[PDB]
Ligand SMILES: Cc1c2[nH]c(c1CCC(=O)O)Cc1[nH]c(c(CCC(=O)O)c1C)Cc1[nH]c(c(CCC(=O)O)c1C)Cc1[nH]c(c(C)c1CCC(=O)O)C2
């Protein structure tokens with residue numbers, strides 16, 4: 089691959105000092121961009137995900153508008169449950185659905201052996217290689233997947249939920265079958281994430297987007313062990329294959345209660361939602377992980393001047409060390425690309441002023 | 445399409461006698477026109493190129509001011525390297541840039557298969573069809589592209605250069621990789637140029653704008669073969685598709701040294717810069733190609749009366765046969781539209797006096 093030119097994001101992820109704070113945005117390839125909507129109108133969602141050229145194009149679009157310090161491959165976390173043998177749709181304007189969710193223990197029999205999942209996800213690896221080549225070393229490329237618990241919630245609920253009552257009912261009433269499913273997911277995720285790195289990914293983020301539905305006791309029993317396993321096994325396999333391990337980011341949205349445990353879970357970077365005060369997060373995680381985040385995505389509805397001031401305040405709280413800027417979740421479809429631009433420029437501007 | 449009403453430019457290109465000398469100007473759709481600047485202020489440069497209506501409008505603007513004998517579609521030669529997978533910007537007042545130029549052989553791996561480029565340039569074909577329809581047969585519409593060597597220089601240098609030292613270093617140190625790249629470009633250009641004709645173009649010009657950096661030995665080894673290939677293959681494909689081949693113009697700026705070879709390269713018309721005395725050019729190319737050019741664009745800074753006299757002298761040197769008037773390069777942004785008008789009127793006036 090082409091030599092990396094701007095490695096600020098990677099240096100920051102490993103905790104090294106940098107000249108400015110690197111920034112990227114979750115869902116930077118997203119519907120808030122008119123050009124994203126146009127490229128997407130061509131195919132259906134999961135068909136877009138299966139076209140390396142389409143994925144590459146969507147990945148590059150934000151970088152043409154903004155000097156973001158990382159790209160993230162266009163894909164979706166739900167490709168893993170799909171590759172395990174579940175059928176999944178993107179309903180017109182009503183999000184992901186599994187018309188036949190997992191509801192009893194016997195339903196696990198329908199899933200593929202987790203060891204064959206990576207072979208089913210070749211299309212993602214093709215997209216990663218192509219995007220890495222086309223990026224031509226501009227900035228690092230992040231690969232990603234959903235965390236076991238979060239993927240379990242989609243598989244059991246059949247979509248989004250305000251309570252995760254069915255998935256949590258599994259945890260309390262079917263603890264053994266839950267662990268079995270969480271292990272299947274872990275065993276699928278590890279080779280998939282390794283394959284993403286083999287294909288060209290230079291960092292990995294694991295999205296535990298539905299952490300907040302668990303309190304600490306269930307999180308520690310059912311989510312944390314598998315989060316830890318994913319990091320340990322991915323690093324081991326990469327070492328063994330003669331490759332360099334990449335920085336790994338754990339993002340547990342609404343996971344305020346788990347920050348101390350997440351800082352010990354074998355990830356270089358702990359991603360934060362907007363509800364956690366940066367200084368409180370720093371006390372929780374300690375001095376040797378990098379934090380990522382955490383501006384309220386809705387702050388981007390404010391004026392460009394206001395966004396600059398909110399960014400300044402955020403960066404004052406995080407300080408110059410061991411920090412990668414981002415929002416506290418993904419960009420929303422109704423947001424203004426110019427305000428995303430203002431966010432990026434302000435992180436760059438204020439982080440330089442904070443140093444010198 | 446509407447039937448062509450004024451075909452003088454085409455008759456002259458094929459070498460037929462005409463009642464007056466037809467004239468057009470390189471960069472006639474350009475910044476010297478206040479109305480060009482206004483229409484352009486709407487979008488960024490490459491976004492203008494992707495709007496058929498914007499391209500059509502820019503193409504027609506000069507024709508509303510001046511009785512030019514041809515239109516040339518508004519586009520840019522750099523759409524080809526873009527469609528091959530390189531990222532390219534139009535920097536505010538500092539021209540084209542590729543932030544990640546090709547610098548080693550392995551960088552060729554990032555490019556698209558040349559056979560898929562035409563599909564990426566549909567927007568240009570749409571602009572051509574629309575402009576041909578809106579022109580309503582007034583005058584012929586010229587399509588165009590950059591020549592392989594010249595496109596290679598942009599791809600390797602990452603922009604303009606006073607020496608082409610990096611691209612020439614490729615020719616001397618990486619001859620094989622250079623030929624590989626020049627072949628990729630040729631194989632992309634042929635289907636693109638054919639598609640321009642399919643879409644409505646009635647003539648084609650290939651811009652070898654950076655010929656002059658090569659002497660004769662390198663030009664014959666690395667530029668000429670691909671110039672020849674482009675013409676041979678475009679004509680073959682058009683024949684085979686049941687379409688009429690169009691006149692093709694090769695313009696090698698600062699290519700004094702290559703005129704004899706260019707006259708044998710399969711182009712109806714050889715375009716000249718202002719440094720070549722017309723009578724010397726005529727001896728070089730012989731009696732069976734048409735010459736195009738060649739007034740110093742800077743001559744348009746002279747008074748309207750002076751421009752008339754310079755034009756008279758130019759036309760005396762070229763003579764009435766096998767000649768299409770133009771400047772020796774494109775119009776510059778600070779030139780006066782009224783002086784462009786004087787140029788057009790003088791060619792028409794003096795060429796009629798030269799015949800009768
Ligand atoms: C709406 C939706 C989709 N997929 C999903 C949803 C949410 C469903 C729910 O919560 O009930 C499922 C999903 N996809 C992704 C996540 C993790 C993000 C999180 O919730 O923390 C989740 C939970 C990451 C992603 N989803 C996507 C990426 C690729 C990276 C990028 O787009 O920049 C990632 C990491 C791409 C994607 N995927 C989808 C769209 C429309 C897009 C474009 C971005 C947008 O406009 O929202 C469909």
Ligand SMILES: Cc1c2[nH]c(c1CCC(=O)O)Cc1[nH]c(c(CCC(=O)O)c1C)Cc1[nH]c(c(CCC(=O)O)c1C)Cc1[nH]c(c(C)c1CCC(=O)O)C2
Pocket residue numbers: 470471472473474475476516517518519520521522534539540588603604605651652653697774775777
């Ligand atoms: C400044 C620039 C542009 N594009 C380019 C440059 C020069 C870069 C360099 O030499 O370092 C690259 C380019 N574009 C074109 C050429 C070939 C002309 C030549 O050098 O012989 C080249 C070398 C043709 C063109 N470039 C364009 C056309 C369309 C036809 C027309 O505009 O009449 C062609 C054939 C349009 C264009 N393209 C651009 C502008 C501003 C315009 C409007 C015309 C003007 O004011 O200069 C941007």
